[PDB]
């Protein structure tokens, strides 16, 4: 199976209430393994998975210095961006950064990325070739030309094609029992009366890992997203995921409606109609 | 492992 390692950074300014809130989180696939929160006790990068606690004291020291260096860039960035957009000091603003890398089932590098947002929309991102930047607006053209002059892409490419894939590989084998598992979805089927004219068929999927799942509704081979209420995939809280899809059916004609579940833990994509 | 060289916007 393919794998990824991703880091997520959110920084939010606090006018008149001091230093920005800084939160960093690291994932391997859909398993969070590290966090730092500027508001927590320790002021250290903290373990969030059993298999990462077997790293030594130098790992945690190092991560703590590097996350605190991210904390700094983000903080100065909030002031810098305020300047670029000429915004007042009385407002709260958000920066978010996401970077990481994908590997294939051979565990070789597939893709690397580094995205950056201001106020919840795209500011600047490293393009697919890891050599160039896409600036969103005129103010981000400044950051881009600054990052071209400072050779930022080169250092990122070296991380994303090298260190990122090297450490992902290490994590995947350190947490083999947790990371390289695939949990098959346990599927249900429920039916409830809206009235005496309408009936809701709801297709369930529980206890799956990884989170990537497709639930689709269909009548006689032709797919039906004209009625498909589809909820967002939600964490169960034990490291597995849940999701459901509903359609509103003319009751009595529930024969020719089929729910299709596809997941990587399924040997064959499941087909299901109401019992 | 985090990236070691972050740079200001």
């Amino acid at each position, epitope marked *: 199976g393919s794998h990824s390692m991703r880091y997520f950074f959110t920084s939010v300014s606090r006018p008149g209430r001091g230093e920005p809130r800084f939160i960093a989180v690291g994932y391997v696939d859909d398993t969070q393994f590290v966090r730092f929160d500027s508001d927590a006790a320790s002021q250290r990068m903290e373990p969030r998975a059993p298999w990462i606690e077997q790293e030594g004291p*130098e*790992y945690w020291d*190092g991560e703590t*210095r*590097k996350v*605190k*260096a991210h904390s*700094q*860039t983000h903080r*100065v960035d909030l002031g810098t961006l305020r300047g670029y957009y000429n915004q007042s000091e009385a407002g709260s603003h958000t920066v978010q950064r996401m970077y990481g890398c994908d590997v294939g089932s051979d565990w070789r590098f597939l893709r690397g990325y580094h995205q950056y947002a201001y106020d919840g929309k795209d500011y600047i991102a490293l393009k697919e070739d890891l050599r160039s930047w896409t600036a969103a607006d005129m103010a981000a053209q400044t950051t881009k030309h600054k990052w071209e*002059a*400072a*050779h930022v892409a*080169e*250092q990122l490419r*070296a*991380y994303l*094609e*090298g*260190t990122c894939v*090297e450490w992902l590989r290490r994590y995947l084998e350190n947490g083999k029992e947790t990371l390289q598992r695939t949990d098959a979805p346990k599927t249900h089927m429920t039916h409830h009366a809206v009235s005496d004219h309408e009936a809701t068929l709801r297709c369930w999927a529980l206890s799956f890992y990884p989170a990537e799942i497709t639930l689709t509704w269909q009548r006689d081979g032709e797919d039906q997203t004209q009625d498909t209420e589809l909820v967002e995939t939600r964490p169960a809280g034990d490291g597995t995921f849940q999701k459901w899809a509903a359609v509103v059916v003319p009751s009595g004609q529930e024969q020719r409606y089929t729910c299709h579940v596809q997941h990587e833990g399924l040997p064959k994509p499941l087909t299901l109609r109401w019992e | *492992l*985090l*990236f*070691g*060289f*972050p*740079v*200001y916007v």
Partner: T-cell receptor
Framework: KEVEQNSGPLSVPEGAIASLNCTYS??????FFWYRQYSGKSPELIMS????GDKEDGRFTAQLNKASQYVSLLIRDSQPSDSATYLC???????????FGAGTQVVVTP | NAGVTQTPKFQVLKTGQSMTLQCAQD?????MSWYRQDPGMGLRLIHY???????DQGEVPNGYNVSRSTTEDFPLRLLSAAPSQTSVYFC??????????????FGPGTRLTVTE
């Protein structure tokens, strides 16, 4: 010793290859350097390498093997002006101490 | 861009004299360092600084102090010279979060000899 460098002195005639090795101990090191320091002078950066594999720049070739934690420098076609102490330097990040090896002195003989 | 300048190149101090070594940098680097170099010891970090106005000790701070009033300038003070301070002191600078390729560049050095 975070960084371990060979010997000294390394005697090589002109035209020959001087191969310098170094070992580091922090697994999370991301940046790798070679400095040249002439006697009575200051260390001068000659090679920087950031990914596994080779990097050529004139007569200099720097190799990096992160899996064995090994940095190397090849000096081909040695000139008498290559006679100096060569220091490898290793870091983890922009706030991490640059970790220097002790140096290996290279003597180029006529 | 001069890069890392440093003065004096040479200095005889007499035990118990104060002196300051100057160091200046052209590159808007955040991260400046002081070292000494000694025959059996290699390069040894004395004090360092990752921004203007802030500093911290290295492995060998004792008998030295340091300030960073501006980003450009990083003077080292020896407040009372001892004969173990005879050494070759090097200022250095890397970008920190400010900049480019993460390369550290060194001043030309200062050869200080302390005698009784």
């Amino acid at each position: 010793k975070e960084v371990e460098q060979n010997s000294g002195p390394l005697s090589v005639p002109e035209g020959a290859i001087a191969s310098l090795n170094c070992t580091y101990s922090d697994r999370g090191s991301q940046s790798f350097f070679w400095y040249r320091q002439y006697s009575g002078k200051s260390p001068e950066l000659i090679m920087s390498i950031y990914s596994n594999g080779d990097k050529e720049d004139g007569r200099f070739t720097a190799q990096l093997n992160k899996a064995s934690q090994y940095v190397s420098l090849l000096i081909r076609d040695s000139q008498p002006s290559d006679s100096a102490t060569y220091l490898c330097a290793v870091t983890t990040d922009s706030w991490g101490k640059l970790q220097f090896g002790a140096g290996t002195q290279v003597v180029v003989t006529p | 861009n001069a890069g890392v300048t440093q003065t004096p190149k040479f200095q005889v101090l007499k035990t118990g004299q104060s002196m300051t070594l100057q160091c200046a940098q052209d590159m808007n680097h955040e991260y400046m360092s002081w070292y000494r170099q000694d025959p059996g010891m290699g390069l040894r970090l004395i004090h360092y600084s990752v921004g203007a106005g802030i500093t911290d000790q290295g492995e060998v701070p004792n008998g030295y102090n340091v300030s960073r009033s501006t980003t450009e300038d990083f003077p080292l003070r020896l407040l009372s010279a001892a004969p173990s301070q005879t050494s070759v002191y090097f200022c250095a600078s890397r970008p920190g979060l400010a900049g480019g390729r993460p390369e550290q560049y060194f001043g030309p050095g200062t050869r200080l000899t302390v005698t009784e």
